[PDB]
Design a protein around this ligand. Structure first.
Ligand SMILES: O=c1ccn([C@H]2C[C@H](O)[C@@H](COP(=O)(O)O)O2)c(=O)[nH]1
Ligand SMILES: O=c1ccn([C@H]2C[C@H](O)[C@@H](COP(=O)(O)O)O2)c(=O)[nH]1
Lengths: 264, 264
């Protein structure tokens, strides 16, 4: 995508050498923002083939408030294997904070339902927020939330959403983080009878790993193709009733996939 | 300031009519980001006189973990009077979340000290974050945090900071939110022996109230003056030991102040 490739070029031209936790260096910039008008089409990177299958199951899993990978395994989705323990537990990550944020007084807060209530009853609210940054449970999580905080907004019958991502691997992580939240905006809007608006991506430490230089130059030489269109085949009774097969992406014609290896 | 006036013009040209909770309409945009190189000077609006006295005491108060306005009153700072109850309590707002985020297991998390520890021991960390968005305590707060979440970043000996502000009154709130966090970046950097870098402001619902149109046009006709320089007179033993008199702003020559009335 145009916005995506411009970011890639910006990290190359303006990034500072910065080390990560494993010791692999990165080229990093701090603070960036991109906007995607969802009416122009589904924001799925075309300059390299992205497989949506995993994204969709992962999102459905988050909505379930599930933090054990069993559901992912029944569908042979292995993207969280790296972090799970022998029982397949990840600790109180995303889904748990979204659906059951624990309070000091013994309650569990359903932020997803809270957000739906606000979108239907008080759409002008400037506090329609979901946060996975639960300070008191950070130590128990396999990993600290990257996509930590997001806010919804309604104006003229259009649902917009801004995500704050504290850390971002532009090559390997970003394509998937964008498609994931754009998808959630489409589900949310369908359930609230609103049109889709903008998905605003805001990043903190936005970077490219130094061992991904050839892959980046290769993708930077490719030309963006038309964006696909997302179609939701049915309208479930609630946000927790979607199923994998309800979604179809039409018109997605990507350039070949590029492999990016990681150090251990 | 240039970035500030450009935002003001953008809300006028691109904002959508949106109602707020009191019923006063606003012109609103969603998602905006500005960057301030703190080495270029202290980001205090010059196209209208801003009084830093209140900003400074409020910040010192936040750092104390104090949520009762008594300290503000001893210094005749009344900016929180509107929200306090008869005892002068605001509930678990900013200072309490910053210094004593309560966990379900009975602990109180000092996010400010946590952040200092990381800046000194693990400066490359991509998780140096402070959040006031404590979902479990929102109902008890006089008001939901506007400046909800911020992240620090170190690269080449420079301390940068990005604030996520969910809601923003460009005329009345913004000048003060910027100066407040820029000040905190200077204190933080002094305590960690780092140079100051960039303060990145990211906003959610960014707006101007409709009864502030004349004031906005008046400020938009003024020319930005040189930015002042902040000087910190001494180096306290810790981040909790600053005092009002440690700060001096030099070279601040603002245009006259503009009053903006609010509906009740
Ligand atoms: O959804 C995700 C999850 C992780 N990352 C990246 C950012 C980093 O390169 C790494 C996490 O490192 P820490 O940031 O946490 O340290 O993975 C993403 O880009 N997106
Ligand atoms: O630090 C602050 C605190 C409040 N506001 C503004 C944003 C809104 O105009 C109002 C809060 O309204 P709600 O957003 O909460 O609804 O005050 C700021 O700009 N800055």
């Amino acid at each position: 995508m145009k916005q995506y490739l411009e970011l890639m070029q910006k990290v190359l031209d303006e990034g500072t050498q910065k080390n990560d936790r494993t010791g692999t260096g990165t080229l990093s910039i701090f603070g960036h923002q991109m906007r995607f008008n969802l009416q122009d089409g589904f924001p799925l990177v075309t300059t390299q083939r992205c497989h949506l299958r995993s994204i969709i199951h992962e999102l459905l899993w988050f909505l379930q408030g599930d933090t054990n990978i069993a559901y992912l395994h029944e569908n042979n989705v292995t993207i969280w294997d790296e972090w799970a323990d022998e029982n397949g537990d990840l600790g109180p990550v995303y889904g748990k904070q979204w659906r059951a944020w624990p309070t000091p007084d013994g309650r569990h807060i359903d932020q997803i339902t809270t957000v739906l209530n606000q979108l239907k009853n008080d759409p002008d609210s400037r506090r329609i927020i979901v946060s996975a940054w639960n300070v008191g449970e950070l130590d128990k999580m396999a990993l600290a939330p990257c996509h930590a905080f997001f806010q919804f907004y309604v104006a003229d019958g259009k649902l917009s959403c801004q995500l704050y991502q504290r850390s971002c691997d532009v090559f390997l992580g970003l394509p998937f983080n964008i498609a994931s939240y754009a998808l959630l905006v489409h589900m949310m809007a369908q359930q609230c009878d609103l049109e889709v608006g903008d998905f605003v991506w805001t990043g903190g430490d936005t970077h490219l790993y130094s061992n991904h230089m050839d892959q980046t130059h290769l993708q930077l030489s490719r030309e963006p193709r038309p964006l696909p269109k997302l179609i939701i085949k049915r309208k479930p009774e609630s946000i927790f009733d979607y199923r994998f097969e309800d979604f179809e992406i039409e018109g997605y014609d990507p350039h070949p996939g590029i492999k990016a290896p990681v150090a251990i």
